[PDB]
Amino acid sequence: REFGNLARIRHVISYSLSPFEQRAFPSYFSKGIPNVLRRTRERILRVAPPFVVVYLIYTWGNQEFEQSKRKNPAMYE
Amino acid sequence: IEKERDVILREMQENDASMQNVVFDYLHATAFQGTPLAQAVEGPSENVRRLSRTDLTDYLNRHYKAPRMVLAAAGGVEHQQLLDLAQKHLSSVSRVYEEDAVPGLTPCRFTGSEIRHRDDALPLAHVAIAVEGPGWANPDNVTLQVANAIIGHYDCTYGG
């Protein structure tokens, strides 16, 4: 329920430092950019194909709609 | 040396069998990390196993100099007798550093930090919280001792 009896943890040592001793943005770009491209590469092949086929269905529906409103060349006479 | 290596390993096991010394060493480690003040007095077990006689002799010839030693006597001791006994036996300990090099104490950086050794099988929890002290020669030590006397100490056997 509360802190004290949540889990049984043994032999685990945690080290932390003070926020005033350390930095808020430690290598925000030189390590942030490889991390964000790592995450994008790991989770890019599960979202991008559905979204691009949504884009294809959207543009094909718009194109077919515009050809449907276009004049039929069968009825010249 | 080998027998005392076995003895110091056994006493290390007895020391971390006790619990306030573990928190004492953990507090010094997390307080003076990166400095020679974090490392414990008894050292690590790997240093226990790899220390040899040459390093002990180097330490003895480096840190047992005369100007860093005080022969202090108290009680029924007569000062002139103590002085002539020191002159007879204890005079001329080293007097030389054999390299013209006296080691110096660099200032130790105190880092605000925390170390948490969670092991729930122990029946009681020991927590030590500290800040940086003033030093030995600082005049505020008496005032801080007054404040520590005001806060104080207690255990479960006090009858107050």
Curated annotation (Swiss-Prot), chain A:
Topological domain spans for side Mitochondrial matrix: 1-41
Q: Which residues carry this modification: N6-acetyllysine?
A: K31
Membrane topology recorded in Swiss-Prot or TrEMBL: Single-pass membrane protein
Q: Where in the cell is it found?
A: Mitochondrion inner membrane
Name of the protein in its database record: Cytochrome b-c1 complex subunit 8
InterPro entries named in the record: Cyt_bc1_su8, Cyt_bc1_su8_sf
Question: What residue intervals traverse the membrane?
Answer: 42-60
Q: How does it assemble?
A: Component of the ubiquinol-cytochrome c oxidoreductase (cytochrome b-c1 complex, complex III, CIII), a multisubunit enzyme composed of 11 subunits. The complex is composed of 3 respiratory subunits cytochrome b, cytochrome c1 and Rieske protein UQCRFS1, 2 core protein subunits UQCRC1/QCR1 and UQCRC2/QCR2, and 6 low-molecular weight protein subunits UQCRH/QCR6, UQCRB/QCR7, UQCRQ/QCR8, UQCR10/QCR9, UQCR11/QCR10 and subunit 9, the cleavage product of Rieske protein UQCRFS1.
Tell me which parts of the chain lie in the Mitochondrial intermembrane compartment. 61-77
Pfam families membership = UcrQ
Q: Which GO terms describe its biological process?
A: cellular respiration; cerebellar Purkinje cell layer development; hippocampus development; hypothalamus development; midbrain development; mitochondrial electron transport, ubiquinol to cytochrome c; pons development; pyramidal neuron development
The keyword Electron transport belongs to this UniProt entry's keyword annotation:
yes
- Post-translational modification N6-succinyllysine, affected residues: K31
Q: Which family does it belong to?
A: Belongs to the UQCRQ/QCR8 family.
Q: Which gene encodes it?
A: Uqcrq
Which PANTHER family does this UniProt record tie to the protein?
CYTOCHROME B-C1 COMPLEX SUBUNIT 8, UBIQUINOL-CYTOCHROME C REDUCTASE COMPLEX UBIQUINONE-BINDING PROTEIN QP-C
| Reported function | Component of the ubiquinol-cytochrome c oxidoreductase, a multisubunit transmembrane complex that is part of the mitochondrial electron transport chain which drives oxidative phosphorylation.
Species this protein is from = Mus musculus
Query: GO cellular component annotations, sorted alphabetically?
Result: mitochondrial inner membrane; mitochondrion; respiratory chain complex III
Top-level taxon: Eukaryota
Swiss-Prot record, chain B:
GO CC: one term?
mitochondrial inner membrane
List localization entries.
Mitochondrion inner membrane
Q: Does the keyword Thylakoid apply?
A: no
Q: What is the superkingdom listed in this entry's lineage? A: Eukaryota
Question: Which sequence positions carry the modification called N6-succinyllysine?
Answer: K3
Tell me if Lipoprotein is a UniProt keyword of this record. Answer: no
Recall the GO molecular function terms of this protein's record: metal ion binding; protein-containing complex binding; ubiquitin protein ligase binding
Q: How does inactivating the gene affect the organism?
A: Results in early embryonic lethality.
Quaternary structure annotation from Swiss-Prot or TrEMBL: Component of the ubiquinol-cytochrome c oxidoreductase (cytochrome b-c1 complex, complex III, CIII), a multisubunit enzyme composed of 11 subunits. The complex is composed of 3 respiratory subunits cytochrome b, cytochrome c1 and Rieske protein UQCRFS1, 2 core protein subunits UQCRC1/QCR1 and UQCRC2/QCR2, and 6 low-molecular weight protein subunits UQCRH/QCR6, UQCRB/QCR7, UQCRQ/QCR8, UQCR10/QCR9, UQCR11/QCR10 and subunit 9, the cleavage product of Rieske protein UQCRFS1.
**Protein known as:** Cytochrome b-c1 complex subunit 1, mitochondrial
Q: Which organism is it from?
A: Mus musculus
